[PDB]
């Protein structure tokens, strides 16, 4: 749909859409930019991720409201509307996963880009898992786990323990273990080890990098406080 707009114009409009809090537009501009076929810079990857996290975040919040109403009620309206929101959410997750598969991941050779995209892949399978039931749920859960694990393996070999993408990946994989995989001990162990190894590497950082790393470390600590 964005085929006639220049790549640079799509990027500029995605930044404007963010300022205007128009996240659906932002995601559509960034989808258009990905479909130009060129790799994304660090800032462009962040725009893609921010756009879709906002879109799916609002869908997830709505799905949770409707699922709670439906569970309390247990006419067809609540289930029908929860199903409509669920299908829309699944469609957005499938769209992001399709961008990652065609062809962002395969072209990502540097650790920073490949880890970022595999973390995204884990996240969007995790959002699919949140609404999945039964056996479909098992394969979706394993797809999230596999993406996160590959990202973890690369991150531990190629990035310092304070790298913000490495830290956010570990945070989100710990949430996966706690909330999706029914592995709270694995969640706690990953969050603790990640926090401690980052603490021991803070001395190497500038003041600005210190601020970025400690912000995510606080999120790990916030979860550990809630889980223990």
């Amino acid at each position: 749909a964005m085929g006639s707009m220049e790549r640079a114009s799509l990027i500029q409009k995605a930044k404007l859409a963010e300022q205007a809090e128009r996240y659906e537009d932002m995601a559509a501009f960034m989808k258009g930019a990905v479909e130009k076929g060129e790799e994304l810079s660090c800032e462009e990857r962040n725009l893609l991720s921010v756009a879709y996290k906002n879109v799916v975040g609002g869908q997830r919040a709505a799905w949770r409201v409707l699922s709670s109403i439906e569970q309390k009620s247990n006419g067809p309206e609540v289930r029908e509307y929860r199903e409509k929101v669920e299908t829309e959410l699944q469609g957005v997750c499938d769209t992001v996963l399709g961008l990652l598969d065609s062809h962002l991941i395969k072209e990502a050779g540097d650790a920073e880009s490949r880890v970022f995209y595999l973390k995204m892949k884990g996240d969007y399978y995790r959002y699919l898992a949140e609404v999945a039931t039964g056996d479909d749920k098992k394969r979706i859960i394993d797809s999230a786990r596999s993406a996160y694990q590959e990202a973890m393996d690369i991150s531990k070999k190629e990035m310092p323990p304070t790298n913000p993408i490495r830290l956010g990946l570990a945070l989100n994989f710990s949430v996966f273990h706690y909330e999706i995989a029914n592995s709270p001990e694995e969640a706690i162990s990953l969050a603790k080890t990640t926090f401690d190894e980052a603490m021991a590497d803070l001395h190497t950082l500038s003041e600005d990098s210190y601020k970025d790393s400690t912000l995510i470390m606080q999120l790990l600590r916030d979860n550990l406080t809630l889980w223990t």
Binding site: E18, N46, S49, V50, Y178, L219
Partner: peptide, 9 residues
């Protein structure tokens, strides 16, 4: 449990 908010560039 909180994941990365990730909603502001």
């Amino acid at each position: 449990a909180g994941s990365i908010p990730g909603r502001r560039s």
